[PDB]
Every structure is written in structure tokens, then in C-alpha cells.
């Protein structure tokens, strides 16, 4: 048994309500296996994402494919949700007569994979040099009583309703909104408010590494 949210506002891992968990990244993790590739740790989450770039079939478009491996229903769901997002988002009209194959491997998961999955893919594609409209970043919020908790580990998804959002750049428009368990209508908007800020931070963190890796050479 645990205390999900102390009255001193401290959670199981010692975070507060509006605090992300640790988020570190790498790009170009597989220079030969892929055209782009990313490795990403988000809390205890751990994902390799690989885009085997525009290759040889719509003549108007490129075709996109997300393949996600864990180490059946839930999987195909996760997949087809991510193909949908990144179909809108990638400029498939710049790469006609072509396939982009996104192959993911989830090494470890501990709450909010979907959000984690999104950030990984986004990183892999920027690395791929594939063009897209904006940068979608992903995140989960959960509702504890009257208080949103901003980045849910697995013990947190079990004890409260969760919302995942994928956010388009520094804007407030959502590419993806998945409200996954019950939330009172009169509390949804505030939860979305927190998702959007955390999502923005994730992007901000994402941007740093892309800055960093860019300075080597």
C-alpha cells in the first residue's frame, strides 16, 4: 500500500503535482540500422525508435507504418493511433512513391508509454530528416481527487483516471487527446491546462538535446 498524494503534496517518488519525471534522450543511435533513430528514457520508460527512411504504393503520397514491439488488442490500438497522428503530421506529399517505416521497441514501461512513444517517434523523425508540420510532444495527466498529477507512473494510472495528450509545438492545439477513464466534465479543462504545459516542457527538453547533438562538429 502507498500514499499516492500526501497532504504535504508529495507523491510515491517524491515529485509534486506539476513536475515531470526524468527525461533524457539521444539521436542517431543506429547510424547504419536506420536513417533516423532515437533512444529515450522518460521516468522508467525506455524506448528505441527507428525510422527506416523514405524508401521504395501511393503515387500521390508516401506510406507510413508504425510497428511497436513489447519485450495484442492494446498494441494494434497504440499502433493505429500513432500512424493516424503522424499521417497528419509528416509531409507525406513531399515524398511520393515511397514508404516510411517506423519500427519501435519498448524496453521498459512505467506509466504513460503512449506519451513516451510520441516523443520517441518525433525524435526519430527529426533525426531521419523527414519533414513534418510541427513537433508533436506527448504527456499524460491523471486526476487525483480535485488535483491533477502531471506525469503518471504506472502506480498512478491504476489509482486514478488518466488523460494522454499529444500537443502540436508550442501551441495549444492537440493532435491527440485520449481521455481514458472517467473525469468530471467540470474538471477536464484544468487537466488539459496542465497536460499542455508539461507537453510544452517536454518539447523544450527535446529542443535542448537537438541543440546539443547539433554542436558536435
Amino acid at each position: 500500500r502507498l500514499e499516492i498524494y500526501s497532504p504535504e503534496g508529495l507523491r510515491l517518488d517524491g515529485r509534486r503535482w506539476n513536475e515531470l519525471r526524468r527525461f533524457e534522450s539521444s539521436i542517431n543511435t543506429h547510424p547504419h540500422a536506420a536513417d533516423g533513430s532515437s533512444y529515450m528514457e522518460q521516468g522508467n520508460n525506455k524506448i528505441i525508435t527507428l525510422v527506416k527512411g523514405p524508401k521504395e504504393m501511393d503515387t500521390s503520397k508516401a506510406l507510413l507504418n508504425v510497428s511497436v514491439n513489447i519485450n495484442e488488442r492494446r498494441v494494434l490500438e497504440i499502433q493505429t493511433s500513432l500512424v493516424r497522428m503522424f499521417e497528419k503530421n509528416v509531409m507525406l506529399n513531399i515524398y511520393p512513391r515511397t514508404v516510411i517505416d517506423i519500427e519501435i521497441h519498448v524496453l521498459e514501461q512505467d506509466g504513460g508509454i503512449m506519451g513516451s512513444l510520441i516523443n520517441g517517434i518525433t525524435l526519430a523523425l527529426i533525426d531521419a530528416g523527414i519533414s513534418m508540420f510541427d513537433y508533436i510532444s506527448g504527456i499524460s495527466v491523471g486526476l487525483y481527487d480535485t488535483t491533477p498529477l502531471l506525469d503518471t507512473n504506472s502506480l498512478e494510472e491504476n489509482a486514478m483516471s488518466t488523460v494522454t495528450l499529444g500537443v502540436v509545438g508550442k501551441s495549444e492545439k492537440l493532435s491527440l487527446l485520449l481521455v481514458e477513464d472517467k473525469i468530471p466534465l467540470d474538471r477536464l479543462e484544468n487537466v488539459l491546462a496542465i497536460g499542455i504545459a508539461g507537453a510544452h516542457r517536454v518539447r523544450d527538453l527535446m529542443d535542448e538535446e537537438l541543440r546539443k547533438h547539433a554542436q558536435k562538429r
Partner: protein, 260 residues
Amino acid sequence: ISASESKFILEALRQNYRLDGRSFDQFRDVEITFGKEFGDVSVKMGNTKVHCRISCQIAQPYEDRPFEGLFVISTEISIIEKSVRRSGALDVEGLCIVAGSKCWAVRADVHFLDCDGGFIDASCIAVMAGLMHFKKPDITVHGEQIIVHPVNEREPVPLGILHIPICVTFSFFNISIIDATLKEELLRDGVLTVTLNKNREVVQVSKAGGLPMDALTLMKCCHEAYSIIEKITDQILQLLKEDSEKRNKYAAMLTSENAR
């Protein structure tokens, strides 16, 4: 859809009317019809017609979950997923008979007759109408592990229902409309499907691609949706009460528990 007919529908929405007369926030008049057997419901939405049939049989539970029964849906044209179970609409823990060894497996086979959109939405009314109109055999489970149960000898019992979730599907253009027809549906650029119950909780929301949508436009949708969901809940409830009355002409004279 011809290039013309598409130009005509799309322009009309830029003006801002819909070819069938109804407005952007308007859900097709819902027509619920109950059949002879309990659990047998037929829902009609403009030119969309769906039939659901609730069935029920002893099974067993999963080794994971000894203290709860099973609920399966199966659709077959001739989201829906989360809602029903997610809401605690159907209390699966109340379908446990003997922890670990015996329980109820409930089914809804949903069958689409004619489709003019509203597949997700009509499906969900159908299951919920079905689920609330259905009745279980009566069992005697004295014997600890021995289950007795029939049939006309005893009157069937309802399932206990804790929310009535309803879906409303918004189609978007490049501008949002509720319960698209098929032709409307084919030209849409994006989908968002809000489920709520009359208790005012958002049971589940789903949006993946295409048109990026504002926090406020989600909220705006949830409200437009809720207002509908009342009507449909009050409708489903009245049509049960009217069905139950028709089957029990003489309830009034038959009550045991009479007030002082």
C-alpha cells in the same frame, strides 16, 4: 461521391447548413424498438438501422480475475470498447457467482442493417438499450458450488447499471458537425468522439490526427454533446418504462411490498 456532389456538400457547410436540414449541433432523431425477448433492441437513426441482442450464459472467470464476470461485444455489418466497461455501466463484479469457478458471461452481438454513418454512436445506444432491457435467469446458488436456475418458474432479474454512457461523434472540416451522414462522413478531415453519462462525467474521449483541435473546441464539443446525452438517456429510460408497463398491464394489483 462525384466531384460535384462533394463540392455541393462542402460548400453548404461553409455557409452553414446541412443538406438534410438539421443543424451543426443536431443528433438524428433516435428511434428505439424493443422486441419480444429481453435484451432485443433495434435502434434507428435517419437511414442508419442497428439491431442488438443481449445474451447471457454461465462461464469459468479468468484466472486473473476470480471475483468478476465477463462482457463481450461483437459487431458485424450486413471506442465502443472503452465506454461500457470503463463507465462501470455493467458491474462485472456483480456477475460473480462463485469466486474463482462460476460467473456470468454477457454478450451483445450488434448487427448493422443499413449504414449512413453513426456506426460508433448507434452501436453504443444499441448496447446500452439492450443492456438495460435485458434480464438474467434466476439462480439458486445454495450448494455453494451448485447452481440452480430457471426459467418461467421464476421471473428474470435485471442487470444492475451504474451509468448510461452515450457516444457523440463529431466530424471536422477545414468547422464541426454532430452525427455525420455517410456522405458528410466521407468528406470529413477529422474525427472526435466524446462519451458522457447523464451524471456529467466524461467517460472517454478519442482523437488521433488529423485536424489539430483547441482545448476550448474540445470543451465546446463536450457541452454540445452532453445536452444531447440527457435527451437520449431520458428517451431510453421512458421507452423501457413504457415497455415494462406494456408487459405488466396489471402491476398495480400485484405488489407485495406495499407502503403504510
